[PDB]
Design a protein around this ligand. Structure first.
Ligand code: PCW
Ligand code: PCW
Ligand code: PCW
Ligand code: PCW
Ligand code: PCW
Ligand code: PCW
Ligand code: PCW
Ligand code: PCW
Ligand code: PCW
Ligand code: 17F
Ligand code: 17F
Lengths: 198, 198
C-alpha cells in the first residue's frame, strides 16, 4: 500500500498546486497585462519614432550611398582601365615568356624523358633480372618453405589431435560433474531468488 | 580438486607443446636460414644492382636537376623582373586607388559616423526614455510579483509543512515495519546465501 499512501500525498500536493496555480495565473496575467500595456505604450513610441526617423535614416544613408555607388562606378571604370591596360601588358609579357620558355621547357622535357628512356629500358630489364632472380630463389626457397611449414603443420596437427582427443575428453569428462555442481547451486539459488522476490 | 585435474591436463598439453616446438624451431631455424641464405644471394645482387643503378640514376638525375635548375633560373630571373614590374605597376594601380578611394572612403566614413552620431545618440536617449518606462513596469509589476511570490511562498511553505508533518510521520511509520520486514528478508537471505556460497 506504499504506492497508494504515497500517491495520496502526491495527489493532494497536485491539488494544492492548482490552488496556487489559480491565483498565480491570474496575478501573472494581471501583471503581464500591465507589462504589455506599458510595452505597447512604449512600442507605440518605439515604432512611431523608429519609423518616422527611419525615413531620414535610410534617406541620409541612401543618398550618401547613392553618391558612394556613383563615385564607385566612376572609379571602377578608370580603375578597370588601369587593370585592363596593365593586364594586357602583363599577359602579353607572360605570353611572350611562356612561348620561348615553353619551347625551352618542352625541349628540356624532351631530353628529360628521352634520357630517362635510355635508362628506363636497361633499368626495367635489370629489374626483371633482379626480380626473376628473387622470384626464382623465392620459388625454390618457397617450395622448401612450403614443405617445411607443411611438415610443421602436420606435427602441429598430430600433437593437436593428442589434445583434441585426450585433453578435450578430460575437459568434457570434467564438464559433467562441473555442470552438476553448477546446476545444483543454480537450482538452489533460484529458490532464494524466487523466495526473496515474494 | 577439479582445478588440479584441469591444470594437470594443461601440464600434459604444455609438454606436447614445448616438445612440439623443439623440432619446429630447429626446422624453422633452417627455414629462416634458407630465407637468409637466399637473401645472401639475392641482396648481394640487389645491392650491387642498386649501386650500379643509383649511381647513373643520381648522375642522370643531376643532369635533370641541372636542367631544371637552369630552367628555373632562366624562368625565375626574368619572371622576377616582370613580376616586380607588374607588381610595381599593380602597386601604383592600387596606389591610385588606396589613396583616392581612401580619402573618399574616409569622407564616406565621416558621413556615416557623423550621421551615426546624430542618429544613435538621440536613439540611445530615446531608448533610455522607453527603457525608463520599461524599467518602471518591471519595478511596479516586479514589486507586485515579489509580493505575490512572497504570499505564495508562505502558502507554499504552509502546504509543504502541511505535508511534511504527516508525510514524515507516515513515512517513518511506514519505514518501521517496512525496514523491519526487510531486515527479516535480509537476515534470511544472508543465511540462505551463505549456505549455498560455500
Ligand atoms: C521500494 C524502495 C523505495 C526506495 C526509493 C527511494 C526514493 C527517494 C527517497 C529517499 C532516498 C534517501 C537517500 C538520502 C541520500 C543522502 C546523501 C547525502 O546526504 O549525501 C551527502 C553528500 C555530501 O558530500 P560528500 O559526503 O560526498 O563529500 C564529502 C567532502 N568532504 C567532507 C570534503 C567535504 O552529498 C553529495 O555528495 C551530493 C552529490 C550530488 C550528486 C547528484 C547526482 C546527479 C546526477 C544524476 C542523478 C540520477 C537519478 C537517477 C536517474 C535514473 C537512471 C536510471
Ligand atoms: C514542489 C516540487 C518542486 C519541483 C518544481 C515543479 C516541477 C513540475 C512538477 C511535477 C510535474 C507534474 C507531473 C506530470 C504530469 C503528466 C502530464 C502528462 O501526462 O503529460 C503528457 C504530455 C504528452 O507527451 P507525450 O505525447 O509523449 O505523451 C502522450 C502519451 N502517450 C504515449 C500515450 C501517447 O507531456 C507533456 O505535455 C510534457 C512536455 C514537456 C513539458 C515541459 C514543461 C517545462 C516547464 C517550464 C518551462 C517554461 C518556461 C516558459 C517560458 C517560455 C519562453 C519561450
Ligand atoms: C531557462 C533559461 C533559458 C535561456 C534562454 C535565453 C533567452 C533567449 C530569448 C528568446 C529566444 C527566442 C525563442 C522563443 C520563442 C518560441 C515560441 C514558441 O513557443 O514557439 C513554438 C510554438 C509551437 O507551434 P509550432 O512552432 O510547432 O507551430 C508553427 C508551425 N508552422 C510555422 C510551422 C507551420 O510556435 C507557436 O506557438 C507559433 C508562434 C508564436 C509566436 C511567439 C512570439 C511572440 C512574440 C513576442 C512575445 C515576447 C516579447 C518579449 C520580448 C523581450 C524578451 C526578453
Ligand atoms: C627508397 C626510395 C627509392 C626510390 C625509387 C625511385 C622511383 C622510381 C622512379 C620512376 C618510375 C615512374 C613510374 C610511374 C610514372 C608514370 C605515370 C603515368 O603516366 O602513368 C600512366 C597512367 C595512365 O592513366 P590513363 O590515362 O590510362 O587513365 C585515365 C583514364 N580514365 C580517366 C578512364 C581513368 O597515368 C596515371 O595513372 C596518372 C593519372 C591519374 C593519377 C593517379 C595517381 C597519380 C599519383 C602518383 C603516381 C606516382 C607513381 C610514381 C612512383 C613510381 C614507383 C615505381
Ligand atoms: C533476480 C534479479 C534479476 C534482475 C531483474 C530486474 C532488471 C531490470 C533491468 C533493466 C530493464 C529496465 C526495466 C523497465 C521495465 C519495462 C518498462 C517498459 O515496458 O518500458 C517500455 C519502453 C518502450 O520502448 P519499446 O516498446 O520500443 O521497447 C520495448 C522493446 N520490445 C518489446 C522488443 C521489447 O521500453 C523501454 O524503455 C526499454 C529500454 C530499457 C528500459 C529503460 C527504463 C527503465 C526504468 C526506469 C529507469 C528510470 C529513469 C528515470 C528518469 C530519469 C530522467 C532524467
Ligand atoms: C600584386 C600586388 C603586390 C602585393 C604586395 C605584397 C607582396 C608580398 C609581400 C609581403 C607580404 C607579407 C606576408 C604575410 C605573412 C606573415 C604575416 C605575419 O608575420 O603575421 C604576424 C604579425 C605579428 O604581429 P607583429 O606586431 O609582431 O608584427 C608587426 C611587425 N612587422 C610587420 C614588422 C612584422 O602580424 C602582422 O604583421 C599583422 C598583419 C596585418 C597586415 C596588414 C596589411 C595591410 C595592407 C594592405 C591590405 C591589402 C589587401 C589586398 C589583398 C589582395 C592581394 C591580391
Ligand atoms: C541598433 C539596433 C539594434 C539591433 C540589434 C540586433 C538584434 C537582433 C534582433 C532582431 C532583428 C532580427 C529579426 C528579423 C530577422 C529575419 C530576417 C529574414 O528576412 O529572415 C528570413 C530568411 C528567409 O530564408 P532565406 O533568405 O535563406 O531563404 C530565401 C529563399 N530561398 C531558399 C528559397 C531561395 O531567413 C533568414 O534570414 C535566416 C536567419 C536565421 C539564421 C541565423 C544564423 C546566425 C549565425 C550565427 C550566429 C552565431 C551563434 C554562435 C554564438 C556566438 C555569438 C557571438
Ligand atoms: C523558497 C525560498 C528559499 C530560498 C533558498 C533556500 C534554500 C535553497 C533552495 C533551492 C535552490 C536550488 C538552486 C541551486 C542551489 C545551490 C546550493 C549550493 O550548493 O550553493 C553553493 C554552491 C557553491 O558554489 P560557489 O561557492 O562557487 O557559488 C556560490 C558563490 N556565488 C555567490 C559567489 C557566486 O553554489 C552553487 O552551486 C551556485 C548557486 C548558488 C545560489 C546562491 C543564491 C542564494 C540566494 C539567497 C540566499 C537565501 C535567501 C532566502 C530567502 C528566504 C525565504 C524564506
Ligand atoms: C517531478 C519533477 C520535479 C522534481 C524537482 C526536484 C526538486 C528539488 C529542487 C531544488 C532544490 C535543490 C537543493 C539545493 C539547495 C540546497 C538547500 C539546502 O539544503 O541548503 C542548506 C546548505 C547547508 O550548507 P552545507 O555546506 O552543509 O551544504 C552544502 C552541501 N555540500 C557541501 C555537500 C555541497 O546551504 C547551501 O547549500 C547554501 C544555500 C544556497 C542557496 C540557494 C538559493 C537559490 C535561490 C533560488 C533558485 C530557485 C530554485 C527553485 C526551485 C525550488 C522551487 C520551490
Ligand atoms: C599543400 C601544400 C602546398 C605547398 C605550399 C607551400 C607554401 C609556403 C608558404 C610561403 C613561402 C615559404 C618560403 C620559406 C623560405 C625559407 C626556406 C628555408 O630555408 O627555410 C628554413 C627551414 C629550416 O627548417 P629546420 O627544421 O632546419 O629549422 C627549424 C628549427 N628546427 C626550428 O625549430 O625553428 O627549411 C625548411 O623549411 C625546410 C626545407 C625547405 C627547402 C626549400 C624547397 C623549395 C624548393 C623549390 C621552390 C618552390 C617551387 C616553386 C615552383 C615554381 C617554379 C617551377
Ligand atoms: C554486480 C555486483 C553486485 C555487488 C557489488 C558490490 C560493490 C559494488 C560497487 C562498486 C564495484 C567494486 C569496484 C572495486 C574497485 C577496486 C577495489 C580494490 O581495492 O580492489 C583491490 C583488492 C585488493 O586485492 P589484492 O588482494 O590482490 O591485495 C591487495 C592489493 N594488491 C592492494 O594493493 O591493495 O581486492 C579485494 O578487495 C580482494 C578481496 C576479496 C575478498 C574475498 C571475497 C570472497 C567472495 C566470494 C567467495 C564465495 C565463492 C565460492 C565459490 C565456490 C568455490 C570455488
Amino acid at each position: 500500500l506504499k504506492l497508494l499512501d504515497n500517491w495520496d500525498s502526491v495527489t493532494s500536493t497536485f491539488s494544492k498546486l492548482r490552488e496556487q496555480l489559480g491565483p498565480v495565473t491570474q496575478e501573472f496575467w494581471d501583471n503581464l497585462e500591465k507589462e504589455t500595456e506599458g510595452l505597447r505604450q512604449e512600442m507605440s513610441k518605439d515604432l512611431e519614432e523608429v519609423k518616422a526617423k527611419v525615413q531620414p535614416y535610410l534617406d541620409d544613408f541612401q543618398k550618401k550611398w547613392q553618391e558612394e555607388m556613383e563615385l564607385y562606378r566612376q572609379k571602377v571604370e578608370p580603375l578597370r582601365a588601369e587593370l585592363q591596360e596593365g593586364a594586357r601588358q602583363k599577359l602579353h609579357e607572360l605570353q611572350e615568356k611562356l612561348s620561348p620558355l615553353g619551347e625551352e621547357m618542352r625541349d628540356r622535357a624532351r631530353a628529360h624523358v628521352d634520357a630517362l628512356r635510355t635508362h628506363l629500358a636497361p633499368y626495367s630489364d635489370e629489374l626483371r633480372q633482379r626480380l626473376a632472380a628473387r622470384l626464382e630463389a623465392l620459388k625454390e626457397n618457397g617450395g622448401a618453405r612450403l614443405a617445411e611449414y607443411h611438415a610443421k603443420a602436420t606435427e602441429h596437427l598430430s600433437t593437436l589431435s593428442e589434445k583434441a582427443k585426450p585433453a578435450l575428453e578430460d575437459l568434457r569428462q570434467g564438464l559433467l560433474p562441473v555442470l552438476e555442481s553448477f546446476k545444483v547451486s543454480f537450482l538452489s539459488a533460484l529458490e532464494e531468488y524466487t523466495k526473496k522476490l515474494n
